[PDB]
Copies of this chain bind each other. A is one copy, B any other.
Amino acid sequence: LAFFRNMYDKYRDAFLSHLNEYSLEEEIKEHISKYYKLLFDYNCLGGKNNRGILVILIYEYVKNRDINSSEWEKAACLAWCIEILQAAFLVADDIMDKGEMRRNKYCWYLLKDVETKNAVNDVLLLYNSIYKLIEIYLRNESCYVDVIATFRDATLKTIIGQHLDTNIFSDKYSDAREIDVNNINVPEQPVIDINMINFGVYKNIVIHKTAYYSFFLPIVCGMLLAGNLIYKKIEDISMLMGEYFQIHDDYLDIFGDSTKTGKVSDIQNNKLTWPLIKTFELCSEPDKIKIVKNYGKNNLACVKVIDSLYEQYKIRKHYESYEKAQKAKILSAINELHHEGIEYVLKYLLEILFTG
C-alpha cells in the first residue's frame, strides 16, 4: 500500500536504466531519459491504484505464509506493471475518445510538446516496458511464462472490447456491405443503431473492455506468483465486477463531478452506455425518436436533450437500484469461492472500488 507506492521509482528507474544502456550519443541519452521519466510520472501516478493494490493483497492473502523482501520486490513489480498497463490504456483511450482531462490534468496527447504522433508511440513504449520489467524481476521464476501470457491474453481481450466500444453503432456494423478501402472522406454523422441497444451486447463489450485487465489479470498475477479449477470461478467473479465497475463509470461520465472524477463525452462519442440502454427500454416512442435524432452529435444542444431525458426518466435513481442488486450478486458469488483469504480480499476490494 504505502509500500507499493514507495517502490514506484525503483521500477521506473530500472526501465529507464535499460534505455540508458543503448548505443547513443550522451546528449541524446539525456534527452531520452528526461522525456521518458515524464512519460511515466505524468501517466502512471495519480490513480486510485486499485488494480496494483489488488495484486499486492491477493499475493499476500492467497495463503498466510512468510514473505521476504526479495519476494515482495517481485510482487510490487507485477503491481506496478498493471499500473503501467492502465497508463498505456488511458493515453490510448484519450486519443481514441478525444479526451480533454484525465486525473485532473490535460491529457498527455494534448500537450503541444507531445501531440498525437508522440502519444501513439508512447502507448507502445509503456506497453512494452511492462514486459521488460517482468523480465528484469521474474525471468527466473517458474511462473514467468504464465505471467506474461496472462498480461498478453488480458490485453487482447481489452483491445477487442475497445474495438467493440468504438464501433458498435458504426456504418460497418449497421450495414454488415464491406469496408470501402477507396473512401477517405469524412464519414457522415454517426448515429445509434437501435438493434444494438440491449444489455446482452453491452455485457459483451464491457466484460472485454474492463473485466479482464482490471480484475482477472491482477488476481491471476497475485495467485500465479504465490505458487486448477478455481481460476474458472475467479474468472466468473471478475466478469461480474467488471460490469459493476463499468456501469458505475458510465454513471460518472454523465452524473459525476469532473472536479472529482478528474475527467470531462460518451453521448458526443456515440457510445453504448448503461444510461442509454436503461432509458431506451423505459421511454416513450416519441422519446426514442428524440434519442435517435440527438445521440452521438457534437452539438451541445443535442447533448442537453439526451441529458434532459436522463433526468426526466430518473436514470440516477435506476443506477442506485442496479448498484444494490449487483453488489449483492457479487458478494453472493464470492461466498461460493470456498477460499477464505481470496474472499477476504475481494470483499475489501468491493467496499473500496469507487474511492480506492
Contact = CB atoms under 8 A, between A and B. Distances in A.
Contact of A112 (B111, B186, B207): B186
A171 interface: yes
B156 A112 contact: no
Q: How many identical subunits does the complex contain? A: 2
Contact of A24 (B105, B125, B135, B204): B204
Interface secondary structure of A, over-half rule:
helix
A124 B121 contact: no
A288 interface: no
A261 interface: no
Of A129, A166, A181, A204, the most chain B CB neighbours within 10 A belong to A181
Given A32-B163, A132-B152, A159-B128, A96 B121 contact: yes
B112 A187 contact: yes
A164 interface: yes
Contacts of A182: 106
A49 interface: no
A208 interface: yes
B159 A121 contact: yes
Nearest to A172: B113
A128 B156 contact: yes
Contacts of A116: 95-96, 116
Contact of A96 (B117, B144, B176, B208): B117
Ranked nearest first, the 7 interchain pairs of A and B with the lowest CB-CB distance are: A96-B117, A110-B184, A113-B179, A112-B187, A112-B183, A125-B159, A24-B204
Interface string A112-126: 111111101101110
B187 A113 contact: yes
A115 B179 CA distance: 12
Contacts of A124: 92, 123-124, 127, 155, 159
A66 interface: no
14 contacts: A18-B156, A22-B160, A22-B208, A30-B176, A31-B167, A92-B124, A95-B120, A110-B184, A113-B180, A117-B166, A127-B127, A128-B152, A128-B156, A132-B152
